[PDB]
Amino acid sequence: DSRKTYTLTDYLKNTYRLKLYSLRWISDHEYLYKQENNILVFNAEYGNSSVFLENSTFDEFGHSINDYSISPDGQFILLEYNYVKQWRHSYTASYDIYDLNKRQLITEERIPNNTQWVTWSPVGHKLAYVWNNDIYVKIEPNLPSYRITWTGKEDIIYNGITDWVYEEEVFSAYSALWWSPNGTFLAYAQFNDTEVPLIEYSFYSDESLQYPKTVRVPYPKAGAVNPTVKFFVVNTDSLSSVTNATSIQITAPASMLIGDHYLCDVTWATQERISLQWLRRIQNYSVMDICDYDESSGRWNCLVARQHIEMSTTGWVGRFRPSEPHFTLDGNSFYKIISNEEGYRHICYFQIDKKDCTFITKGTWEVIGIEALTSDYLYYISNEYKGMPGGRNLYKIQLSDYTKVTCLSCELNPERCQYYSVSFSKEAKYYQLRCSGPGLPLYTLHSSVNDKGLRVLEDNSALDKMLQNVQMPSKKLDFIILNETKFWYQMILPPHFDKSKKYPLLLDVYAGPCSQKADTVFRLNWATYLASTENIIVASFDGRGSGYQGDKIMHAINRRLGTFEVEDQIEAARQFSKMGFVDNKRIAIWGWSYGGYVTSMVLGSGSGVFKCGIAVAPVSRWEYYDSVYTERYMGLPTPEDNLDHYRNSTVMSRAENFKQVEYLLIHGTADDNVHFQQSAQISKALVDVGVDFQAMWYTDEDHGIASSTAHQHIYTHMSHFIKQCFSLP
């Protein structure tokens, strides 16, 4: 063979690029799509377009525009710029509104600078924005704001936005406001961080800064004091008629009030009915309230007959958070994903005043998500097809006859596409299918009335052509058996793979609870280069604790992080050698984040299986990590709860066993999530026992080490180390 391989320059410089089809549905019939930096509107039924916004229109705006969003009624567009990333989801920016009718910018009563979030009402053109930790509402883009809260206080009181931990762990989103479905009410959460301890780290900034600055974030580590939360609803329709419109509190149930708790879900049901879920600090008990506006009293009431209680015997509640409800039009019933009697996650259907739900799906497989609900159908993604827990397909269940279930995606192109996501139009008339593997991604448009394919949106044939002429790795997804249970693994295999030759193996690890590293997604990444150019088999493996294959497996690491998930990676490696195509002298392991911890635990296990390993931004001790995530899996680090296992599960306690391996440790200094602290303590421990290792810090990089230069630097650095570890003299 004489075609070039997939090299590291190829990966780092993005020579081979995936084409996407990111559309935004503006109605049941139309979607927006960015083409040549023009923004086009598409008729779904026929596939014709017009230009919605010409690429010339903001030439003389004077600012690089970061993003855009159109009022639901089409009359205005919101423009975002001066974007500066905050955490994983949060950022600040400047904003302006362009009147789409008048074809004019709006210059009075403008959204202030340094605004933290902004949302259109779901209908019409109301705006809700958060500035200086307070909520404000405009009825019309050009009119003065109404202030909603007066309590905003930097790092202390958050109205309508999350604090660090609620952003990262609880909502995995920044905003904490929820418009009612026709824009009348605005629901919002308020977070109090007064007694939450601060993480403190240096930020060095450009070299022109003489003194480093101290970044200080309220961040509760395990067992520490948590933010408290309150919930409010204001009637925005009365702001123009009243001076200071009252924010009506809905208090948490008495069974949450008895101690530390969380607000873990907000979902509107109807115009006058909202639902909330709370979760005790011990994350095995949740309560859903369903609350109705009492018109004559102006107050919200949650009838105890409508409360629903979820609880767990074998582990925590939900995959990561208690699962969200989906309401039928009338708000009298709802669908929720919950773990059945066998431990598998399936769709359960509730009436709002009955506690017992009815299961509409079942089997040894799981529903991944509920994607849309019409009067006749519920659409959902699952891994049912062919018993492949790492597969994804779109299903449709007939509401009047549960035995009538159609796979809408399975057989469309079943050699090329086993992993789907979906985007439904506003009332589910159309759906876009997004196939992400095991062949090249494919984007298709479908009409829901007949379930027929309307046209191919993006098929990536341009790329396929280029890839024909490159020695690509292949991928093997399969299982092995242990104690009579299936555990999946995938392998990125060098081109011309030969079962008779002996290959070096790199074990790629994440292995956190409900993770999945063995799937059917097509990826171009570092592993691609390693299999293609360096002839390394890159393996991953879903051992105990992993997701989408049921509770028996997922909860097996309940309260016991740093055990089975760790042993099973080692076991995985023993089984690859046993396959006879793996050089037992050249087994490596590497992981980022949770994977950094597992890699490190495996390297300090004293197993003899691995020659070397790389840990990037690892957890090193569970007490250093955040309360919400750590406590969900570990409980509390108190003598009466689970301290023994917190202390027994640190990387540092294994320092002496790192004498047997070559170790590369890497961490960004401004990592606000897994604090440099945690690698500072691994390195100190290794020094203390006289172990030599390799280290790299990334100045002002966070958990993602995602900046362009640093991204390339870290994969270059790691490549040398892998090659060095494997080099044969």
Ligand X SMILES: *[C@@H]1O[C@H](CO)[C@@H](O)[C@H](O)[C@H]1NC(C)=O
Ligand Y SMILES: *[C@@H]1O[C@H](CO)[C@@H](O[C@@H]2O[C@H](CO)[C@@H](O)[C@H](O)[C@H]2NC(C)=O)[C@H](O)[C@H]1NC(C)=O
Residues annotated as catalytic (active site), given as ranges: 593, 671, 703
φ and ψ of 613, to 5 deg: -160, 155
Q: Shortest Cβ distance from residue 174 to ligand Y (Å)?
A: 20
Stretch that binds ligand M51, among 164-172, 188-196, 223-231, 355-363 (CB under 6 A): 164-172
Interface positions, 652-681, toward ligand M51 (CB under 6 A): 673-674
Q: CA-to-CA distance for 284 and 560, rounded, in angstroms?
A: 16
CB distance 660 to 606 below 8 Å: yes
Q: CA-to-CA distance for 234 and 364, rounded, in angstroms?
A: 45
3-state secondary structure 570-606: HHHHHHHHCCCCEEEEEEEEEEECHHHHHHHHHHCCC
DSSP conformation letters of 477-501:
EEEEEETTEEEEEEEEE-TT--TTS
Confirm or reject binding of residue 408 to ligand M51 (CB under 6 A).
Answer: no
CA dihedral 61, 62, 63, 64 (to 10 degrees): 80
What percent of the chain is helix, strand and coil (3-state, nearest 5)? 20, 35, 45
Q: Which is nearer to ligand Y, 94 or 182 (CB)?
A: 182
Q: Shortest Cβ distance from residue 43 to ligand X (Å)?
A: 4
Closest CA to 289 of 330, 256, 335: 256
| Interface with ligand M51 (CB under 6 A), residue from 409, 593, 607, 650 | 593
Give the Cβ contact number of residue 95 at 10 Å: 17
629, interface contact from ligand Y, ligand M51, its own copies, none, CB < 5-8 Å by kind: ligand M51
Q: Which two tokens stand for residue 40?
A: 């086009």
Q: Shortest Cβ distance from residue 569 to its own copies (Å)?
A: 24
Q: Which is nearer to ligand Y, 206 or 295 (CB)?
A: 295
Q: Shortest Cβ distance from residue 475 to ligand X (Å)?
A: 37
Task: Determine if the peptide bond prior to 438 is cis (ω within 30°).
Answer: yes
| One character per residue 42-71, x = contact with ligand X (rule: CB under 6 A) | -x--x-xxx----x----------------
Q: CA-to-CA distance for 691 and 663, rounded, in angstroms?
A: 10
Q: CA-to-CA distance for 680 and 697, rounded, in angstroms?
A: 10
| Interface with ligand M51 (CB under 6 A), residue from 11, 334, 395, 594 | 594
Return residues touching ligand Y (CB under 6 A).
Answer: 150-151, 157, 182, 184, 192, 194-195, 235, 237, 244, 271-272, 295
Q: Which is nearer to ligand X, 37 or 214 (CB)?
A: 37
Confirm or reject binding of residue 382 to ligand M51 (CB under 6 A).
Answer: no
169, interface contact from its own copies, ligand Y, ligand M51, none, CB < 5-8 Å by kind: ligand M51
| Interface with ligand M51 (CB under 6 A), residue from 37, 104, 132, 172 | 172
Stretch that binds ligand X, among 37-45, 202-210, 471-479, 534-542 (CB under 6 A): 37-45
Confirm or reject binding of residue 364 to ligand X (CB under 6 A).
Answer: no
Q: Are strands 285-294 and 299-302 parallel, antiparallel or unpaired?
A: antiparallel
Q: Which two tokens stand for residue 458?
A: 């993006």
Q: Which is nearer to its own copies, 449 or 728 (CB)?
A: 728
CB distance 617 to 667 below 8 Å: yes
DSSP conformation letters of 315-344:
S-SSSSSPPPPEE-TTSSEEEEEEE-TTS-
Q: Shortest Cβ distance from residue 656 to ligand M51 (Å)?
A: 24
Instruction: Give the helix ranges, DSSP H, for 359-415.
Output: none
Closest CA to 514 of 651, 632, 617, 395: 632
Q: Which is nearer to ligand Y, 155 or 237 (CB)?
A: 237
Q: Shortest Cβ distance from residue 645 to its own copies (Å)?
A: 16
Q: Which is nearer to its own copies, 123 or 710 (CB)?
A: 710
Q: What type of residue is 113? A: N
- Rounded alpha-carbon distances, angstroms, from residue 492 to 19, 577, 606, 688: 22, 16, 27, 38
Closest CA to 526 of 77, 92, 10, 1: 10
Q: CA-to-CA distance for 379 and 368, rounded, in angstroms?
A: 11
| CA angle (283, 335, 364) in 5-degree steps | 75
Q: What type of residue is 367? A: V
Confirm or reject binding of residue 392 to ligand M51 (CB under 6 A).
Answer: no
Q: Shortest Cβ distance from residue 547 to ligand M51 (Å)?
A: 8
Return residues touching its own copies (CB under 8 A).
Answer: 197-202, 204, 207, 210-214, 221-222, 224, 621, 623-624, 650, 652, 669, 675-677, 680-681, 683-685, 687-690, 692, 694-700, 709-710, 712-713, 716-717, 720
Q: Shortest Cβ distance from residue 503 to its own copies (Å)?
A: 25
Q: CA-to-CA distance for 664 and 369, rounded, in angstroms?
A: 38
Q: CA-to-CA distance for 621 and 626, rounded, in angstroms?
A: 11
Q: Which is nearer to ligand Y, 38 or 235 (CB)?
A: 235
Strand order in the sheet with 117-120: 117-120, 127-131, 134-138, 146-147
Q: Which is nearer to ligand Y, 197 or 363 (CB)?
A: 197
Interface positions, 320-339, toward ligand M51 (CB under 6 A): 320-321
Q: CA-to-CA distance for 714 and 65, rounded, in angstroms?
A: 30
Q: CA-to-CA distance for 558 and 553, rounded, in angstroms?
A: 10
680, interface contact from its own copies, ligand Y, ligand X, none, CB < 5-8 Å by kind: its own copies
Confirm or reject binding of residue 629 to ligand M51 (CB under 6 A).
Answer: yes
Q: Shortest Cβ distance from residue 321 to ligand Y (Å)?
A: 24
| Interface with ligand M51 (CB under 6 A), residue from 80, 167, 169, 551 | 169
Q: Shortest Cβ distance from residue 154 to its own copies (Å)?
A: 18
| Interface with ligand X (CB under 6 A), residue from 303, 305, 309, 311 | 311
Q: Which is nearer to ligand X, 41 or 665 (CB)?
A: 41
Report which secondary-structure segment, H or E, holds 77: strand 76-85
Q: Which residue is nearest to ligand Y (CB)?
A: 271
Q: Shortest Cβ distance from residue 669 to its own copies (Å)?
A: 7
Q: Which is nearer to its own copies, 308 or 621 (CB)?
A: 621
| One character per residue 247-286, x = contact with ligand X (rule: CB under 6 A) | -----------------------------------x-xx-
Decide: helix, strand or coil at residue 18: coil
Q: Which is nearer to ligand M51, 316 or 576 (CB)?
A: 316
Which residues here bind ligand M51, judged by CB under 6 A?
168-169, 171-172, 320-321, 512, 593-594, 619, 625, 629, 673-674
Which residues here bind ligand X, judged by CB under 6 A?
36-38, 41, 43, 46, 48-50, 55, 110, 112-113, 150, 244, 282, 284-285, 311, 313, 635
